[PDB]
Scaffold this active site. Structure first.
Site, PDB file in Angstrom:
ATOM      1  N   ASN A  88      37.290  41.377  46.257  1.00 11.13           N
ATOM      2  CA  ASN A  88      38.576  41.590  45.800  1.00 11.13           C
ATOM      3  C   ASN A  88      39.553  42.068  47.103  1.00 11.13           C
ATOM      4  O   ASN A  88      39.233  43.240  47.382  1.00 11.13           O
ATOM      5  CB  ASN A  88      39.797  41.992  44.784  1.00 11.13           C
ATOM      6  CG  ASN A  88      40.918  40.298  44.462  1.00 11.13           C
ATOM      7  OD1 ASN A  88      41.495  40.022  44.703  1.00 11.13           O
ATOM      8  ND2 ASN A  88      41.984  41.455  43.584  1.00 11.13           N
ATOM      9  N   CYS A 133      35.987  45.810  42.390  1.00 11.28           N
ATOM     10  CA  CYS A 133      34.561  45.570  42.628  1.00 11.28           C
ATOM     11  C   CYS A 133      33.877  47.098  43.744  1.00 11.28           C
ATOM     12  O   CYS A 133      35.354  47.424  44.755  1.00 11.28           O
ATOM     13  CB  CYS A 133      34.561  44.395  43.910  1.00 11.28           C
ATOM     14  SG  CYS A 133      35.486  43.029  43.016  1.00 11.28           S
TER      15      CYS A 133
END
EC number: 2.3.1.-
Lengths: 328, 328, 328, 328
Positions: D81, D1
Site C-alpha cells: 500500500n 504491509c
C-alpha cells in the site's frame, strides 16, 4: 510539580520547584521572624517558630501556610501533588506526632535545623487530614526536604506507613511513589549525553542529522514519570560534565525543560495547567529566588535583609508583571 | 536551532529563534540605518541598505553579517544549521542572482519589504559558497523568513534547486529538508492536549497519575526532528486553546521547551551545545527582544529609538550578566 | 520471558509463556502420572504426585524439574526470570512451608487443584535457596499460576515477604516487581486501538500515513517493562474487540509481538537472547502445545492420551526441526 | 504491509512480505507456465509470459493478477500500500511504456529475468490508473523488486515522475516515500544491540532490569514508519551478528515482530487490520513459502515440481486451517 536540588560551583546548595497548577492560590512570599507566635484562629492552636522562615504561601485569618520555603538554618521543604497513592489518617493517632497536611511545611521549617533532625522527628510522625478550615480541604501531597549538607529526603504517607526515603537522585515529581520512580530510572540506562555521529547499517551509511542522537528515547510529555526522568538525567549530565560551571541560572535551565506551557496540558475542565512559578532557594544565603509564568525575571527576597528578631510577619507581592531591560 | 513565528492577542507578529551552538561567535546586536553603504573590504563589494536593519550578528572589517534580524518594514529572517542536505554552488551561476551564504541574511533584510517580494526575488536566485574571508568558511544554513502578514517561508538550497516552501507550521529546525519534517508531523496525529483521566483495561482500572497523559508519545530528546515536533504541537495547542491570551512571554515558554541545557548535549569534541540566546522580533514595532543562556531577562532594542536616517552602524553589547530584581 | 493467560471463544483457558534465554537447558516435555514417587537422589527427598503433571523441564538424576507446566485438574504454573528484586532465604525458616526454588513448579502442580488452593498454601510458605545439586545453582524466579476459573496470581518473594498478587492484567514478564508494572500501565491511558485518520494543525492538514496512529507511544524494545505494556494492551484490545473470535492461534500472535529475534538482543557475553520456545497450555483439555525458535509449527502433547495411573515418567523430544507442508 | 529481502547462510536469497489488510481478497497461489497467453476478456488485451510465474493473487475472468510473486529466473516482486504520495496517470502517456496498476506485478515477472533488466525497462515506463474492470478500482501501490544478485529496488510513482530507488536497507513498508524512510533511519543512530548493564547516575547506581536496554527508543506501534525502523534494525542486527546462522525461519522471526494482531489495529469501520499472510520466496529454488494468520505452519509450493512448459494455469488453495503436530 517538579522539585530539584543542585549544588553550585561555589559549594552553595540550591533547592526549589516548578509549581505546576491551573490556577492562582492567592499566593505571596511570606517572611516569619524567629520566636514568632503563629496563631490559628480556627482551632485556637498556635505554633511558635524556633527559626525564621521565608517561602511561598498564603495567609488564612492571619495564619501562614506554605507551598515551599526555607529557614535561617538552611533547611528547605517543598510540597508537591501526590494523588492516588497518598493516605492520611482521618483523625489523630494516639502516641504519634500528628501534623495536619496543610501545616507540614511550616512544622518542618519552624522547628528543625537539618534533614537529620527532621528524619529523627518523622520516625514517630503521622500526617492527618484535618483542614485549615472545614471549607478549605487539604490537597494530596508529598514532600521533598533538603539542606546545606546536600542531603535530600522524600516524605510520603501511604496506608502502610509514613515513608522517609533518602533521595540520591536530586529530584521529585508526583505519583507514583518515590521508589517507583527510582526503579523507572533503570529503564533508561541506554541514554547517552555524548553525540552518536553515525551508524553503519550494512550497505547503508546512517548519519546524525544534528546534535542529540544519544538521548533518543527520552520521553517528551509532561506526565510526572516523564518529567522525573528528564530532570534526573539533565541534572546528572550537568554534574558529570559541568560541575565546576554550575550556577543559579542552571537551576532554571533544568526546570524550564519540564515546565508546562499554556494550551497543551489541558484539564478535563478545559483549563491550561501551567508552571505558575519556579522557586530556587539558596540555602546557605537565606535568599528565596523565584520567577513566574508571566514574569520570567528572577526576583530575590533575602531573609537576612530583615530583622530575624522582628515582631511582624512580612509579605512580598507575587510578581506577574513582565520585567524587560530596555537597552536603548 | 529552533525558529518560531507567533501572533499575539493584539495582532502583533513575533518571529525569532533559539540559537543553539557550543561556542560564542563574537556576536553583538547590530543596527544599520537606511541608505547605508555596507562596504566589504575583502572583495571591495558593497551593499547599500534600502531599509533600516536590526539583528544579531558580527562585524568583519567594518562589514556587518547577521545570524537573524528584522527591518523597518516588519520583515524578519533567520539562518539555522542545515547539514548534509544543503548544496551551494562553488561559483556564481550565469543568469542567476548569486548571493554568498554569509550575506543572505543582509541581502533579504536590506532589500525587501515583505515575504511576497522575497519570494519573487528568489525565483531566479542561487546561493553561492563564497566566504566572507578565505579563512572564515561559510556554514551550512537554511532560512526562515516571515513578515507582518503572518506568512512565513523556508528557503533551502539542495543540489536539485533553491527550494522556497510556504511554512504553515510556524516552525523550523535543522536537517532533514522541510518537506521531510512536514511529513513527519503525520506520525503524531494521535497526540491529544486534553487529559485522558482513565482507561478500562478489562478487569484492571487504569488511572492517570497526573496531567499530560494525552501527549505520551511526544519525543523528548534534542534532535532537530524531535524539536520540530514539540514546537509544532506546543504552538498549535496554544493557538487552539489560548489565541486570545498569547503575548510576548508565551514565545519564550514555547522555545524554552526545546532549549538545550548545559551538559546533556555533548559534541564529539566534548563541548556542551547550549541555547546561547533566544531572540523574539516584534515585527510591527521594530523591537528586537532577546535573552541569553547566562541572563534570562528579556532585553529590548527598539530600532525606532534610533535615527533611521543616521550615518553610523550602531552596536549593542550581548548581555551575559544575569539580571536579578532584588525585592527587599 | 513473557507469560500470558487468555480465554478462547469456547470458554477454554489458555496459559503459557515465551521462554526467552540465550541457551538450551537440555529441555524435554515431561509427563508424570498421578501417585508417582519422584525421588531426589541428591538429598534422598521425595515428592509423590497427587495429580498427573505435564510440562517443559529437565531431569536431574531421575528427578523431574519444570520451567512451566500443567496438571490434570487444569492448574498451570510458569517460572520467569526475576533478577535484583527477588530474595530467597539461605536456609529453611522454622514454622514455614519451605520450598526450594527449583522445586516450586513441581510442588504447585503435584499438590493442588486450583489457584484458590495454592493461595491458601502460600500464606505460610517460604522459598529457600537450596539447589538441586551444589554445582547447579538456582536462578532468580517469580511465578505466574492460573487455572480453569480464569483467575491468575503472581508469586514474588522479596526480602520483606512472599507476595501473592491477584493478576487482573493476564500477563507477566520480569523485573521490577508486579505492582511496579501495574502502576506503569497507568502511563499508557492515552493509547487508542482505533485509527486516528487526521489532525487539524491550524493551517496545516495532517493525515494518517497508514493504520495504527492510535498506538504511537507504545514502546518497541525488548525490556521486561516494554514487553509487559505491549502484551497487556494487545491482550486487552483482542478481548474488547474480538472476544468471540479468540482461538489457539491468537495466543501465539500476541506473544510473537514480544518474542526476541536472533541478533538484536545481545548479552554482555555476545550471545543472542532468543524466544527459545512458546508454550500454550489448554487447561481444561490437558494439552500442552508449544513451538520453538527453530520449528514454528505448533506441537501438541495431550496428557489424556497417557495412562494417568501409569508407572513411568515419560518424555517427548524438544522439537527443533522446521516442519513444512509441501503443498505440491 | 512490510517487505523484506534476506540472504541465508547458504547464499540463498529470500524475498517476501507481510500482507496486512482487514479483509480477504479471494486469494489463491497461482502458477503460470512459460509461453502462456494470459487473456484479459475485459479489454481483449493479452500478455504472453516469457518466464514461468508463481505467486499470490486472484483470477478475474480467467486473467491472473498478483499481489506478490516470483519467476523461474529468481526475480521477485511485491506490491505494498502507498496512499497519499502516489500519483497515477489518468490515461496512457504517449511515448511511454504504460502499465496498468493491477498488471504491474505480472508485467515485471512475466517479462524480465533480473533487477537490472527491470531497471532499464522502467526508465521509460508510466503507471496508469486503468482498472481490471470498471467496478474493481485499482489500489494505491508501490513495489519492491529483488533477485538472486541480492539487489533490491523500490518503484514509486509520484506526480513528479516514476522513481526507481536502489534499496540498501532490505525493507519496505508504506507511506511516506522511500527516501523519507531512509532519512528517518538517521534518527536511530543511537540504538545498540548490545546490552547496557548499568549506568552511574551520580550517587544512584542504575541497573538493567533485563536484557534489551540498548534498544530503548525503538518505536513499538504498527504505523508504516515504525514498522520500517523495526525491520531495518532487526535485519541489520541479524546480519551483523548472525550472518552464518541465517535460515528460512529467521525471515519469519523478523516479520513476526511487525505483524498486526487482531483487535489492536482497528479501522474507522471498526474492522481489525491483520497480517493476513506472510510470504517468503526462495528465489534460487523457485519455492513460494507462506503461512497465514489462521495457520502459522509454513506451506511450500515449488514451481519446479510443475511442468514449466505446461498448458494450464494452476492454483493452490489459500490455507487457513491450523496445522498441528499431534506428538502423542
Amino acid at each position: 510539580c517538579t522539585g530539584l536540588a543542585l549544588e553550585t560551583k561555589d559549594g552553595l546548595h540550591l533547592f526549589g520547584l516548578n509549581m505546576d497548577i491551573e490556577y492562582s492560590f492567592n499566593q505571596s512570599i511570606i517572611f516569619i521572624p524567629r520566636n514568632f507566635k503563629c496563631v490559628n484562629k480556627s482551632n485556637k492552636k498556635e505554633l511558635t517558630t524556633k527559626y525564621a522562615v521565608l517561602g511561598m504561601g498564603t495567609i488564612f485569618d492571619d495564619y501562614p501556610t506554605f507551598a515551599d520555603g526555607m529557614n535561617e538554618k538552611g533547611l528547605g521543604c517543598a510540597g508537591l501533588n501526590f494523588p492516588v497513592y497518598v493516605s492520611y489518617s482521618k483523625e489523630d493517632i494516639e502516641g504519634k506526632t500528628n501534623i495536619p497536611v496543610y501545616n507540614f511545611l511550616l512544622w518542618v521549617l519552624a522547628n528543625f535545623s537539618s534533614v537529620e533532625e527532621v528524619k529523627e522527628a518523622l520516625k514517630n510522625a503521622n500526617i492527618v487530614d484535618i483542614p485549615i478550615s472545614e471549607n478549605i480541604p487539604n490537597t494530596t501531597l508529598h514532600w521533598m526536604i533538603s539542606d546545606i549538607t546536600g542531603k535530600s529526603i522524600v516524605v510520603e504517607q501511604t496506608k502502610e506507613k509514613l515513608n522517609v526515603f533518602d533521595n540520591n537522585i536530586g529530584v521529585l515529581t508526583n505519583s507514583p511513589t518515590f521508589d517507583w520512580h527510582v526503579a523507572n530510572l533503570n529503564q533508561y540506562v541506554g541514554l547517552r549525553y555524548n553525540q552518536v555521529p553515525e551508524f553503519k547499517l550494512g550497505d547503508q551509511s546512517l548519519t546524525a542529522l544534528g546534535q542529540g542522537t544519544g538521548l533518543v528515547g527520552l520521553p517528551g510529555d509532561f506526565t510526572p514519570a516523564s518529567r522525573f526522568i528528564r530532570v534526573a538525567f539533565l541534572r546528572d549530565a550537568m554534574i558529570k560534565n559541568d560541575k565546576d560551571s554550575i550556577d543559579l541560572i542552571e537551576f532554571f535551565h533544568i526546570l524550564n525543560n519540564v515546565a508546562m506551557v499554556r494550551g497543551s496540558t489541558r484539564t478535563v475542565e478545559e483549563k491550561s495547567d501551567l508552571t505558575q512559578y519556579t522557586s530556587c532557594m539558596c540555602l546557605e544565603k537565606g535568599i528565596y529566588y523565584y520567577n513566574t509564568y508571566e514574569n520570567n525575571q528572577i526576583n530575590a527576597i533575602d531573609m537576612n535583609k530583615e530583622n530575624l528578631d522582628g515582631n511582624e510577619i512580612k509579605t512580598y507581592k507575587y510578581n506577574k508583571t513582565l520585567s524587560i531591560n530596555h537597552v536603548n
